[PDB]
């Protein structure tokens, strides 16, 4: 039973662009350290509607995503499976 | 506050390659092949091991093709490069 | 978003006892020994495809890797004491080595 | 063999010190419709004991990974107490 789950806490540093939904998360563990940028893909429609209707840009979220890494150069896929809105972005 | 951790289950599809940093800090590097679905994509992840007790456990006891459970802190350095610093490992089934 | 997930690696130290819920489910125990102390966990399997895989292919003493959703509910003993019963509903399993 | 557990929930108690280790409870409720699961966490690691007493307050949403142990005790008859030795914690949102 292979898997690759990713748990991310950070701020949504982009708008929700429709294509399924796509957005970026800025994760900065150390106040002085680096800021990690992850591209999130959302296929589940109930979560797509929750993002566009309730979540604003800059919101602090906790996202669980299935991770996929295609090698050809590597392409990292992060399909969101669940999200919890910690603090919205006003 | 913020964090980005990843939990991986899969088979080690490479050898344990020893390296050294410009700060003379030794670390290990290996790859994990994870395929969740038979009709799906096979995911390859590059793991970096800094913890010295885990470096010794991998080279002496773990062999190629071993089914492992690896938990690592993920970092995405800028194209982008995904870093996975192993923080804990559990050997499910070793390799023949 | 709250959860309580459990990952167990051990040997099945019991048979697969089939029950009914009112849907069906089986029950078995896993003997996990790290380093020493031996931990005894009671697993519950509701997923029908995994129920068939356990009863038909897995034998007692098999080394398995089980992921289960952990649940905890409190019961009241008659002598005023207060105990906790741990539930582990199996969600996925990988057979490492059979018995 | 191993048995680890990952919990995300809110600390529903104070940090009670014993001997040396720390003790607190986590209320995990996956659904408002459903039940609230309660887990007792034991903290042995010194750097994590200090992080709990210095930064974390009651009601904080945390993500805790702990090594699980199932202790059986005779009483009367028998009972079971689940031990969760905290190995790592990530604070999602602190309490007030």
Swiss-Prot record, chain C:
Taxonomically, which superkingdom? Answer: Eukaryota
The primary location reported for this protein is mitochondrion
- Tell me the Gene Ontology biological-process terms attached to this UniProt entry: DNA replication; mitochondrial DNA replication; mitochondrial genome maintenance; positive regulation of mitochondrial DNA replication
Q: Report the locations given in the UniProt record.
A: Mitochondrion
The keyword Transit peptide is assigned to this record = yes
Keywords tagged on the record? DNA replication, DNA-binding, Mitochondrion, Transit peptide
Q: Where is the SSB domain?
A: 3-97
Molecular function via GO: enzyme activator activity; single-stranded DNA binding
Coiled-coil regions in this chain?
none
Q: Which residues form the signal peptide?
A: none
Q: Name one GO cellular component term.
A: mitochondrial nucleoid
Listed under subunit, the entry gives: Homotetramer. Interacts with PIF1.
Function as written in the Swiss-Prot or TrEMBL entry: This protein binds preferentially and cooperatively to single-stranded DNA (ssDNS). Involved in mitochondrial DNA replication. Stimulates PIF1 helicase activity.
Q: What other facts are recorded?
A: Present with 3060 molecules/cell in log phase SD medium.
Q: What is this protein called?
A: Single-stranded DNA-binding protein RIM1, mitochondrial
Name the source organism.
Saccharomyces cerevisiae (strain ATCC 204508 / S288c) (Baker's yeast)
Q: What is the lineage of its organism?
A: Eukaryota, Fungi, Dikarya, Ascomycota, Saccharomycotina
């Amino acid at each position: 039973m292979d898997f690759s789950k990713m748990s991310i806490v950070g701020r949504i540093g982009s708008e929700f662009t429709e294509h399924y939904l796509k957005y970026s998360i800025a994760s900065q563990p150390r106040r002085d350290g680096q800021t990690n940028w992850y591209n999130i893909t959302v296929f589940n429609e109930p979560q797509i509607n929750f993002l566009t209707e309730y979540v604003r840009k800059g919101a602090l979220v906790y996202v669980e995503a299935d991770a996929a890494n295609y090698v050809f150069g590597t392409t990292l896929s992060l399909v969101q499976k669940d999200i919890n809105l910690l603090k919205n972005g006003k």
